[PDB]
Amino acid sequence: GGLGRCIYNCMNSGGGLSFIQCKTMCY
Asked: Which domain holds residue 4?
């Protein structure tokens, strides 16, 4: 899928941005 890993790498450790910028941005 995407959201599953999106926030994972984005938030867990692999984004360098924010949460709302990935928890929702990711399609």
From this structure: 1-27
